Design a protein around this ligand. Structure first.
Ligand SMILES: *[C@@H]1O[C@H](CO)[C@@H](O)[C@H](O)[C@H]1NC(C)=O
Ligand SMILES: *[C@@H]1O[C@H](CO)[C@@H](O)[C@H](O)[C@H]1NC(C)=O
Ligand SMILES: *[C@@H]1O[C@H](CO)[C@@H](O)[C@H](O)[C@H]1NC(C)=O
Ligand SMILES: *[C@@H]1O[C@H](CO)[C@@H](O)[C@H](O)[C@H]1NC(C)=O
Ligand SMILES: *[C@@H]1O[C@H](CO)[C@@H](O)[C@H](O)[C@H]1NC(C)=O
Ligand SMILES: *[C@@H]1O[C@H](CO)[C@@H](O)[C@H](O)[C@H]1NC(C)=O
Ligand SMILES: *[C@@H]1O[C@H](CO)[C@@H](O)[C@H](O)[C@H]1NC(C)=O
Ligand SMILES: *[C@@H]1O[C@H](CO)[C@@H](O)[C@H](O)[C@H]1NC(C)=O
Ligand SMILES: *[C@@H]1O[C@H](CO)[C@@H](O)[C@H](O)[C@H]1NC(C)=O
Ligand SMILES: *[C@@H]1O[C@H](CO)[C@@H](O)[C@H](O)[C@H]1NC(C)=O
Ligand SMILES: *[C@@H]1O[C@H](CO)[C@@H](O)[C@H](O)[C@H]1NC(C)=O
Ligand SMILES: *[C@@H]1O[C@H](CO)[C@@H](O)[C@H](O)[C@H]1NC(C)=O
Ligand SMILES: *[C@@H]1O[C@H](CO)[C@@H](O)[C@H](O)[C@H]1NC(C)=O
Ligand SMILES: *[C@@H]1O[C@H](CO)[C@@H](O)[C@H](O)[C@H]1NC(C)=O
Lengths: 846, 24, 24, 27, 857, 23, 24, 26
C-alpha cells in the first residue's frame, strides 16, 4: 500500500569525476544521482578513501573510462543497488571501458538495471567478468545488450572456483572469490533482499527490514514523494525521474544531454526537457504551449549518424536540409535499442530536402523508424546528382519503409546493392513512389542477386509430413499441393506456378543430426552438410541407405526455373529411424580357468542400434582332437600340444554410344545338454541381462575345445512384433566364434593298476590297466626301470599303444638283478605322469 | 577433339537432370 | 533419384514404400 | 545430387534415369 | 578378266538400332552398308523372328553393345562376308561388348577384316571366342590388336568339342558346336571357299560359283561400278568406299563419323567427306578450294549459353556470327570444371560478330577461357548499339582477358556493374582496348561502387623473411614495416592504415609442397590445402609441429576489416626444415651361421631424415646362462634344442567496438643404454684371445647385411643396429655436449650363435684300481671349453659278453673335486668303458672306449 | 516376393517403379 | 561537428586545435 | 596534420596535453 524508503534522499545533479582523486568529494553523501555519473581520466586512483555507501541508485547511467590506479569498483560504490536508465548512453546503462587496474567488478549490492544494458570491454585485468548472470539483473523483455570482451581472460583469468552461488546454473557466479551472486526467485526477480526474502512490489531493488517491522524500500517502484513510495505523483507535483518536484524545482533542475544543457519544464504532471509533439517552449521558458499551425517546423542540418548517440541530436527535427546526404551507418553488435533511439531521434522528420544514404549498417533492422517521412526532395542528389536513395552493404537491413507508407522521390534514382537480407520484391515497392513512376529499375541501379541472397525471401511454407519409417529408408510427403496455371480455386492451399515449364519439382534435403538443431543449407560454395536430393514433381521421396536408430533432419524447397520468383520451403522437421540390427559384440576373449571352467569376457564398444535387452552366450563342444595316422610316436615324441586402367575403353565406347536429343541361430533358448554319462555338458547356453561383461561355465569336459558365441539382441518394436509375421526379424546381432580349450585335467589319472610278474630264465612281464578317460587318446605307453644299485639311472622304452594287453601285460627280457619299474601313459594332450614304483627280481641259477 | 557423357559424369560429378537429356 | 537394395534391406525398402499391403 | 559413376555403374544409372529409348541418331 | 559381283547392289547408309526390335526393319534387303552398323541397348532381342541374309559387307566397324536376349550373333547376319574396316573405332573394326545373353557368334561366312583389330569381352556366356585364330581373319600384315577377356571361359564351355573339323594349336577351328571354321591356303589369303576352292584375287571374302561354271565375287577388293569389280574407278566418277558414283550422288552420300554428319564432296576422283588441310568447301559443295584467307575457320551461330552442356555444342567454332549476342549465363555454380568445359567449347573462338554478354554467372572465375579471342567486331552491338561488352551481375568474376590478349572492340561502349570481385583497376585495362580510345569510363558505363566491392584491389607486396628453422618449427618475420596508424607525421612506409583498429593483423599461410610450385589460390570451391594461422598483429609467427627435413611453402596476407581497402600480401616462398633425428632401422633379423658367426640383415623402409651418412652395428656378449642350483640332472637330462566452409569472417565485433569507441571519445572530451656418443669403431677380444666380447663397426650406407666372426660358441649376443645422418654446419657450433641426436634409436635383437661342432668332450680318461678287493676307479678331465657348465657326467660300460647290454651311470658335477674320479665294484671278467659329459647345452659327445680286466678270488 | 528382387537389385529402380508394386 | 573524432580522425586536425580539449 | 584515431588518438592527445582536462559542469 504505502511504504517509506530508507533514509531521506539527498539528490544531486549529474556528476563527473575528472583528472585526480580529490574531485570524488563532489560525490560525497549524495543519496541519489539525478543524472549520469561518470569517472574518467584519473591517472592514479589508488589514493582514494572514504567509499560512499550512502549512494544507492543513479537515474541515467554509469561510465568508467580510463581510470587508473583503481583495484575494484566496489571501493567507490558500496551500496549501488539499481540503475534506472531513464536517459541512456548509446543503448548502454553501464560502461566500464579501457581500465587497466580494475581486476574486480565488486558490485555485490547491485540488483536491477531497468533499461538498456552493460558494456565491459578492454579491461585486461578484469577477471570474473563473465561470472555473473547479467540476464537476471537486466530487464527481461530484451536482455540482448551485454558485451564482455578483451578482459585478459585468455589464460591469466582462470581462477573460476570462487566461493564454489557455488555452482548454480553451471557457474560459480561471483564477484570474485569474496562474494557470490545473490539470486532472487522468479516470483520476485531483482526485487529480493536475500535468496528467499522477497520484497514488496511497491519497492524496487529490495527493502530494509528491521526488528520493528518498519520495512523500507531501497528504491521506489515508480516514484517517490516525502520519502514515501507511491505508484504515481500526487496532485500539484510533477514527476522528475524517480521523485516528484514542485514547479520551481523542475524549472531549476537540469539534464545534460548531447553536450548541451536542458532545463526541465513542468508539463502534464511531468518535468520534461522537450515539449512533446505539437508544442513549444514558452518565451519565458516555464511552460509548453501548442505550436502555431499545429506543429513547429524546426529544420536541422544533414550529416552522418555513426551511432545511436548521434541520432539523439535530431530529436524534434521536422525538415532535414543541406547538400550533404543524410548518411546512416549505425554499427551495433546486433543490439536492439536501435529502433527505439532512432525512433526518438528522427521520427519527427516529414521530408528530407537532401538525399538519403544507408551505408555499412550493422544490426539495423528496417527504415520503419522514419514514421513521419513523406518526401525526399533530393534537391542535390548524391553521386554526381544521379541518386537520391543509396543503400549499400547493410548486413542486416531486411525491410524498407513501413506498411503502406509513401515517400515521394523527386529527383534521381535509387541504388540498392549488397543487402544480404533485403529481397528484390521489397525493393520493387518503390516503383510507384518515384516521380517518374518507372515500371522497372534501370539494370545498373538494383543488383539482382546481391540483394536478399542470404535472408529468406518472400516465400510461402510447405506442410511436409512423414508417411513411414524403417530400418534403412523413410518416405516423405509434401501435403501443400502445388498447381499449374489457373488454380480454379485459389487460397485452397497455394504455390501456383503460371507456366507448366516453370516448376521443376520439390527437392528434399537430409543429413545426420543427433541433436536435431542443424541449420538450413546456405548458398555457400562448399557447404556440403546437407545431402541434397534430385527434383521430384510428384512430391514424394524415399530416403535410402539411412543409419538405423539415428536421428535425422530434413526439409523441402521448391525448385523452378530462375525466371519464376515464386518459392516455398518447409520447416526443419526431424525424425529417427527404427532399430534395425544390432552390431557384433567386440573384444570377445576366452580364457581357460581349470579342467572344467571356461571364462568368457567381452565389451560392447559399438553402436547398439537400439536397446539391447539381453545377451546370449552359447558354448558347444567341438569334437576332440585326434591322432593322425602318420604320427611318428615313440620316435618323435611331443611333450605338449595346446596352441589351438582398362575401363578407359568402356568410357570411350560410352562417349560414342549416347548422344543427347534436340551357426544359423535364428532362434534360441536356454539349454544345457548334459553328456550321456552325466559328467559334462555337451552344449551350454544361457540368456543374460545387459549387466554382464563376463561369464564362466562349469562342469566342462577336460581337454576339449569349445566354440563360444556372444550375441546381443535388441528390443522388439510393436510393428516388427506382428508385422514381420514369419520372416527375417533379424533382431539379434551377428557374431564370430571364438575357440578355447580346457586344460589337461587333474595332476593325476593317467595310468593305474600296475603289477609285474614272470613266467616261472623266465622273462619279466608288466601289467597295467589303461586310463578310463585320459586327456585324449593314449598314443604311447612308456615303461621305465632302474636297478637297485646306488647312483643308478633309469632306463625306459616306448610302445605306440599297441596290443599291449594281448598277453595281459608287456613282456621284458632283462639280466640278473633287482629292479624297480614305472609306467606312464602318454596322450595327444602331452606327456603324462608316471605311476608308483614296483619291483621284481631276476635270479636264474646255474 | 570430342567430349561426351563419360567426361560429363565420370571424370567429374554431374546432376541428374543431365542424364535426363539422353532419353527419347 | 534412384534406389538400390537387396535382401532384408530390400524388404524394409518395400515395407516403407508401401504403407498399405503388398501381395506375396 | 552428384552421380559420380563410370562404366557399368553409369550405364545402370542411365537405365534408372529414364525407361524410354535413349538417343535419336539421325532418326 | 573381270566379273560381276554377287547380285545387284543396293547400299544403305550408316545406321543404328536402339530401344526396340522393330527398328531392325531398317536392314530390310540391304546388300551393303556405306558406314558403321551398330546395334545396342535392345533390352530383349528374343522376339525377333527374321534374318537379313542379303547383308554381305560393312564398309566401317560394327559394335554390338549391351544387346540382351540375343544368343547367336548369326541370327542377324547370315552372310556378313567382309568387314572392310575402312574407318576404325578407337582403332578397332569389330566390337562385341557386354552382351549378357550372347553365347555364339556363328559368322560362318565372315572371311576378312581388312583393317583394325577385334575386341570381344564381357560376354559372360560366349563360348568359342577363342576357337578362331583371328590373325588368319585380320589383314595380311601385323594387326596384333585382338583382345578377348571375361567371356565366361572358366569351366562352363563343355561344348567346345566342336564337330571334330580343322584343328590347330591343339584346338578346333570352329565358330560353335556345329559351325566349323575353314582357312584358306596361302595362295589366296581370304578369298576362298574351302581349303582348296579359291577364287579370283579380284574378289574379297568369297565367291559364288554357278552351275554354268561362271564365278561371281561377293565383294570387290578395290572398287565396283555397275555391279562390276575392277582395280580403280572409271573417270567421270568418284570413289566412295566400295562403289564408284556420280558427283550428283556423292553430294548426298554423307557419313556420320561424329555427333554431326559430314556431307560428301566430289574431289579428284574421291568422294571425300571433308576437304584436306587448308582447303575450303564451296557453298554448293561441288568442290573444295584453297582457303580464301589462307586459314579456314568454322562459323557458328550466336545463342544463349545457359549451361555447360549447352556450351559443348560450340566446339571447333572460330567465328561467332548472327545478330543475337553471345550470352554467357551459366547460372550453375559447377565449381572447378566450369573452366574446363567453357574452354573446350570456346577456346578456339577468334572473332565475334555481335558482341559478348556475361550475365548472372555464379562460378565463372574469369574470362581467360577466350584463349584465342582477338576481335569483338560488335557489328550489331548490344542495346540499341550502346554497348559491345556487357558484363553484369557476376558473383565471382575476378579477371578479364589474361595477360596481353588484345581484343580490339570496334563499335559501341562497354557496361560493367554489380561485379563484386572485379576490381575497377582491372576494368581500366580496357581503356587502350576500345577503338574509340576514350581516356576514361563514365559512371554510367563502369560502376564506381558496384564493382570490386569485395575484391582484393591495389594489393601491395610484403617482404617475408624466415629468421630461423628448426627440426620441427620455424619463425617468420614480415620485414615490410606497416604504419598501422597515420605516420603523424613522417613520410615513407609504403603501406599504411588510417586507423589502428582497422588492421586485425597478419595471417600466415603454409602447407607441405614437395615441388615448391604450389600457388596462392586455385579454381576450386574451397581448396583446404593451405593451413591458415590465426590473425597475428605482432608481425612475427612461429610454425610448430613441422615434419623435419620436408619442403614447405608459405605466404602472408593482411586481414583488414571489410570497409578498409588498403591491403597487401607477399609472394609465395619455400623453405625446408632441419634433418632432425633419423627413424629406426627396419626388420632387423639375425641368424646364426655357426658357433662363431652371425648374419645380421636389415633394411630401411621407414623414411630417413637427412642423408644416411653411416650405418652402425654393435654386438655385446650376454653372460652365458648357467645352471640354477635348485634344478636337478640325471633325473631330467637335457636334449635342449635351442631358442631364438569459406564464409569470409564477420567483422561485426570489430566494427561495433570501433564505433562505440568513437562515440565514447566524442562524449568524454570537451573544448573550452648406448648413448650415441659411444657410436664408434670398437673391438675387444677376451683375455683368451679367442672371441670378441664387444664388437662394433661403422658401415657405408648401402650394406644392408653384415656378418660377424670370432664369436663365442653357444652364447647370446645382443645385436644392435643404428642409422645416422650428417650434422648441419649450424648444428656443429650450436651444440656443445647436449643436442647431438645424430643417430636413430635401436631395436635390440638377440641371437644365440650355435653349439660347438664337436661340442663338450671329455679327455684323458683312464681306469684305476686301488692296491691292485677295492672297487675299480675311473678318472678323467672335464672338457676344456664346454658349452656352459657340465651339470652331469655320464659313464657307460659293458661286459665283453653277448648277453649283457650296455650299462651306464650318471653323476652330477659334484664329487669330482677330490681327485676328479669315480668308483664302482664289479665281478670277475673284462669290460669296456666309455664316458661323456652333459651340459646346459645338451648331451656331449662320447669318448673313445676303454677296457679293463677284473679277477678277484 | 516377386521379380522386384531383380527389378531393383540387378539394376537401380526409380521411385515410381518401386511404388508400382504396392497393392 | 564539435566532437574530437569528427575534428580529428575524419577531416584531420592540428596540434593547435587539439590543445583546446585539455587546457586547464 | 594529425589523423590519429581510437587508442592512437587517445594516447596522442594524452601526450600532447598531460596537464589535466578541462572537463564539464565546471
Ligand atoms: C582521505 O583522503 C583525503 C584526501 O583525498 C585526506 O584529506 C584525508 O585525510 C584522508 N582520510 C583518511 C582517513 O585516509
Ligand atoms: C553531506 O554532504 C555535504 C557536502 O555537500 C556536507 O556538508 C554534509 O555535512 C553531509 N551530510 C552528511 C549527513 O553526510
Ligand atoms: C495500412 O496499413 C495498416 C497497418 O499498419 C492498416 O491498418 C491500414 O488499413 C492500411 N491502409 C491502407 C490504405 O493500406
Ligand atoms: C501422402 O502420400 C500419399 C501417397 O503416398 C498420398 O496419397 C497422400 O495424399 C499424402 N498425404 C496427404 C495428406 O495427402
Ligand atoms: C499446414 O497445416 C496446418 C494444419 O496442420 C494448416 O492449418 C495450415 O493451413 C497448413 N498450411 C499449408 C500452407 O498447407
Ligand atoms: C546444436 O547442437 C550441437 C551439438 O550437436 C551443440 O554443440 C550446439 O550448441 C547446439 N546449438 C543450438 C543452437 O542448439
Ligand atoms: C574370470 O571370472 C572371474 C569371476 O567371475 C572374473 O572376475 C574375471 O573377470 C574372469 N576373467 C576375465 C578375463 O575377465
Ligand atoms: C542387473 O540387471 C537388472 C535388470 O535385469 C538390474 O535391476 C540390476 O540393477 C542389475 N545389476 C547389476 C549389478 O548390474
Ligand atoms: C516377325 O517376322 C514377320 C515376318 O514373317 C515380321 O512381319 C515381324 O515384324 C517380325 N516380328 C519380330 C518381333 O521380329
Ligand atoms: C625480425 O624480427 C625481429 C624480432 O624477432 C625484429 O627485431 C627485426 O626487426 C625483424 N627483422 C627486421 C629486418 O627488422
Ligand atoms: C623488399 O625487399 C627488397 C630487398 O630484399 C627491397 O628492395 C624492397 O624495397 C622491399 N620491399 C618492401 C615492400 O618491403
Ligand atoms: C609441380 O611440379 C611437379 C613436378 O615436379 C608437378 O607434378 C606438379 O603438377 C606441379 N604443380 C604445379 C601446381 O605446377
Ligand atoms: C627443397 O628446398 C631446398 C631449399 O630449402 C631446395 O634446394 C630443393 O630444391 C627443394 N626441393 C625441391 C624438390 O624443389
Ligand atoms: C649372410 O651374409 C652374407 C654376406 O657375407 C650374404 O652373402 C648372405 O646372403 C647372407 N645370408 C642371409 C641368409 O642373410
Amino acid at each position: 500500500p504505502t511504504m517509506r524508503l530508507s533514509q531521506n534522499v539527498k539528490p544531486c545533479k549529474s556528476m563527473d569525476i575528472r583528472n585526480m582523486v580529490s574531485h570524488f568529494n563532489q560525490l560525497e553523501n549524495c543519496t541519489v544521482i539525478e543524472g549520469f555519473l561518470l569517472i574518467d581520466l584519473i591517472n592514479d586512483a589508488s589514493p582514494l578513501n572514504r567509499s560512499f555507501p550512502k549512494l544507492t541508485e543513479v537515474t541515467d547511467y554509469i561510465i568508467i573510462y580510463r581510470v587508473t590506479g583503481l583495484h575494484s569498483l566496489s571501493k567507490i560504490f558500496p551500496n549501488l543497488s539499481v540503475i534506472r536508465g531513464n536517459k541512456l548512453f548509446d543503448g548502454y546503462a553501464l560502461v566500464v571501458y579501457s581500465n587497466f587496474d580494475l581486476m574486480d567488478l565488486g558490485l555485490h549490492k547491485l540488483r536491477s538495471i531497468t533499461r538498456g544494458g552493460v558494456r565491459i570491454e578492454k579491461n585486461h585485468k578484469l577477471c570474473y567478468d563473465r561470472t555473473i548472470d547479467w540476464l537476471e539483473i537486466l530487464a527481461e523483455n530484451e536482455t540482448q545488450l551485454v558485451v564482455l570482451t578483451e578482459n585478459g581472460k585468455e589464460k591469466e583469468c582462470r581462477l573460476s572456483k570462487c566461493p564454489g552461488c557455488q555452482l548454480h546454473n553451471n557457474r560459480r557466479l561471483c564477484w570474485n572469490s569474496k562474494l557470490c551472486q545473490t539470486k532472487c526467485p522468479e516470483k520476485c526477480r531483482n526485487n529480493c533482499i536475500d535468496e528467499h526474502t522477497c520484497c514488496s512490489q511497491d519497492c524496487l531493488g529490495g527493502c530494509v527490514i528491521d526488528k520493528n517491522g518498519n520495512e523500507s524500500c531501497i528504491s521506489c517502484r515508480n516514484v517517490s514523494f516525502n520519502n514515501i513510495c507511491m505508484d504515481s505523483c500526487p496532485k500539484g507535483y510533477y514527476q522528475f525521474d524517480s521523485r516528484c518536484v514542485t514547479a520551481n524545482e523542475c524549472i531549476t533542475l537540469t539534464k545534460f544531454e548531447t553536450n548541451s544543457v536542458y532545463s526541465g519544464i513542468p508539463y502534464n504532471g511531468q518535468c520534461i526537457t522537450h515539449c512533446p509533439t505539437g508544442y513549444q517552449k514558452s518565451e519565458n521558458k516555464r511552460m509548453c504551449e501548442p505550436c502555431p499551425g499545429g506543429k513547429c517546423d524546426k529544420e536541422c542540418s544533414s550529416g552522418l549518424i555513426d551511432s545511436l548517440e548521434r541520432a539523439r541530436e535530431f530529436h524534434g527535427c521536422t525538415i532535414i536540409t543541406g547538400t550533404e546526404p543524410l548518411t546512416i551507418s549505425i554499427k551495433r553488435e546486433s543490439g536492439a535499442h536501435v529502433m527505439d533511439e532512432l525512433k526518438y531521434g528522427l521520427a519527427a522528420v516529414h521530408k528530407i530536402q537532401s538525399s538519403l544514404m544507408v551505408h555499412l549498417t550493422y544490426g539495423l533492422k528496417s527504415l520503419k523508424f522514419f514514421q513521419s517521412l513523406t518526401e525526399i526532395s533530393g534537391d542535390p542528389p548524391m553521386d554526381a546528382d544521379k541518386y537520391a536513395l543509396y543503400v549499400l552493404d547493410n548486413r542486416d537491413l531486411d525491410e524498407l519503409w513501413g506498411p503502406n507508407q509513401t515517400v515521394f522521390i523527386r529527383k534521381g534514382g535509387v541504388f540498392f546493392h549488397f543487402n544480404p537480407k533485403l529481397c528484390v520484391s521489397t525493393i520493387n515497392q518503390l516503383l510507384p513512389m518515384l516521380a517518374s513512376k518507372p515500371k522497372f529499375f534501370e539494370k545498373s541501379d538494383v543488383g539482382a542477386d546481391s540483394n536478399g541472397n542470404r535472408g529468406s525471401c518472400g516465400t510461402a511454407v510447405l506442410n511436409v509430413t512423414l508417411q513411414s519409417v524403417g530400418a534403412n529408408s523413410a518416405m516423405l510427403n509434401v501435403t501443400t499441393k502445388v498447381e499449374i496455371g489457373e488454380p480454379q480455386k485459389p487460397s485452397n492451399a497455394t504455390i501456383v506456378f503460371k507456366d507448366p515449364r516453370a516448376f521443376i519439382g520439390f527437392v528434399f534435403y537430409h543429413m545426420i543430426d543427433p541433436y536435431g538443431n542443424s541449420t538450413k543449407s546456405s548458398d555457400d560454395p562448399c557447404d556440403d552438410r546437407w545431402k541434397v536430393s534430385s527434383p521430384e514433381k510428384s512430391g514424394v521421396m524415399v530416403l535410402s541407405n539411412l543409419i538405423p536408430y539415428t536421428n535425422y533432419s530434413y526439409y523441402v524447397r521448391t525448385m523452378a526455373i530462375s525466371s519464376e520468383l515464386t518459392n516455398a520451403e518447409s520447416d526443419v522437421k526431424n525424425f529417427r529411424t527404427n532399430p534395425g540390427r544390432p552390431s557384433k559384440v567386440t573384444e570377445v576373449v576366452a580364457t581357460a580357468i581349470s579342467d572344467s571352467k571356461i571364462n568368457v569376457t567381452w565389451s560392447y564398444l559399438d553402436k547398439p542400434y537400439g536397446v539391447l535387452t539381453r545377451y546370449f552366450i552359447k558354448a558347444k563342444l567341438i569334437n576332440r582332437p585326434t591322432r593322425n595316422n602318420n604320427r611318428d610316436y615313440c620316435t618323435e615324441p611331443l611333450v605338449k600340444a595346446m596352441e589351438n586402367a582398362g575401363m578407359e575403353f568402356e568410357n570411350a565406347l560410352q562417349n560414342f554410344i549416347f548422344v543427347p536429343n534436340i551357426d544359423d541361430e535364428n532362434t534360441y533358448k536356454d539349454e544345457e545338454d548334459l553328456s550321456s554319462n552325466k559328467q559334462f555338458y555337451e552344449v551350454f547356453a544361457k540368456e543374460l541381462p545387459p549387466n554382464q561383461t563376463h561369464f564362466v561355465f562349469e562342469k566342462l569336459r577336460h581337454f576339449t575345445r569349445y566354440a563360444i558365441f556372444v550375441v546381443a539382441c535388441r528390443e522388439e518394436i510393436p510393428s516388427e512384433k506382428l508385422r514381420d509375421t514369419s520372416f527375417k526379424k533379424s533382431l539379434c546381432s551377428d557374431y564370430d566364434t571364438v575357440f578355447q580349450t580346457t586344460k589337461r585335467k587333474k595332476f593325476a589319472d593317467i595310468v593305474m593298476d600296475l603289477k609285474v610278474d614272470l613266467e616261472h630264465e623266465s622273462p619279466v612281464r608288466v601289467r597295467w590297466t589303461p586310463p578310463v578317460d585320459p586327456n585324449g587318446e593314449i598314443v604311447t605307453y612308456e615303461v621305465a626301470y632302474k636297478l637297485q644299485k646306488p647312483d643308478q639311472v633309469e632306463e625306459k622304452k616306448c610302445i605306440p599303444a599297441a596290443d599291449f594287453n594281448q598277453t595281459a601285460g608287456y613282456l621284458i627280457k632283462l639280466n640278473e638283478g633287482l629292479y624297480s619299474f614305472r609306467v606312464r601313459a602318454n596322450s595327444i594332450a602331452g606327456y603324462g605322469d608316471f605311476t608308483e614304483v614296483e619291483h621284481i627280481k631276476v635270479e636264474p641259477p646255474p | 577433339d570430342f567430349r561426351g557423357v563419360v567426361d560429363s559424369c565420370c571424370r567429374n560429378s554431374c546432376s541428374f537432370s543431365t542424364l535426363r537429356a539422353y532419353c527419347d | 533419384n534412384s534406389l538400390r537394395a537387396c535382401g532384408p534391406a530390400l524388404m524394409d525398402m518395400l515395407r516403407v514404400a508401401c504403407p498399405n499391403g503388398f501381395n506375396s
